[PDB]
Design a binder for these strands. Sequence first.
RNA 1: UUACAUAA
Lengths: 115, 115
Amino acid sequence: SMIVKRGDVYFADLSPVVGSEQGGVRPVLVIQNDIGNRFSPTAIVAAITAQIQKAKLPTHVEIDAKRYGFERDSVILLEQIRTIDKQRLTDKITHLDDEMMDKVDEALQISLALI
Amino acid sequence: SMIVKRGDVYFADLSPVVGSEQGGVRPVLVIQNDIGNRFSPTAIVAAITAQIQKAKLPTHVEIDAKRYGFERDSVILLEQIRTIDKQRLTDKITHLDDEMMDKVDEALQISLALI
RNA sequence: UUACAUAA
Ligand code: NA
């Protein structure tokens, strides 16, 4: 399988889904550790949306599109995470810096009560 | 949406899946924080399996069925996470104690590179 | 009447 790295953002097809799950083709952020990312057929990712541009919850991290290379201002949803097989991935969009990933890590810890 | 709690174990159908995403009806462990569990229509869960013969990865936590009231000795796969609509949850099996959840937390931190 | 894969 393709190698990916924590911090990578890829388009992925998350369909089909049930109820309030996030579906469709959308950007996703790789949040699995890099050992699994190297050896496993699967990655763990967080959904990104543009339906909001500002964080509503402490599990949200805003992405400034111009700074980070996105089409529009988006938000990473650390309450919407899932293990996906790498075949769902298509094109790599970008790789987020440490400033962003530190915010992602805090949001993930809150999301999963690891605080 | 129904109230669930971190530490709860429910059956859920994780299918349909692609590739090596954990599929089928199986127990899942709620790992989302309880504020999210109260206010959101989705729950973040980890898949559980009974294939205890596979090599134990650092993202795996073993469940002794006699102690914890399961049908057979099982393994919590913290590399297999899903955010699912609560309507997927069916029968409640049990609620895991703090000793078990401390091991889950450690494995989750390894899975998501939050060590 | 409830997987496979994945950690030098
Ligand atoms: Na693909």
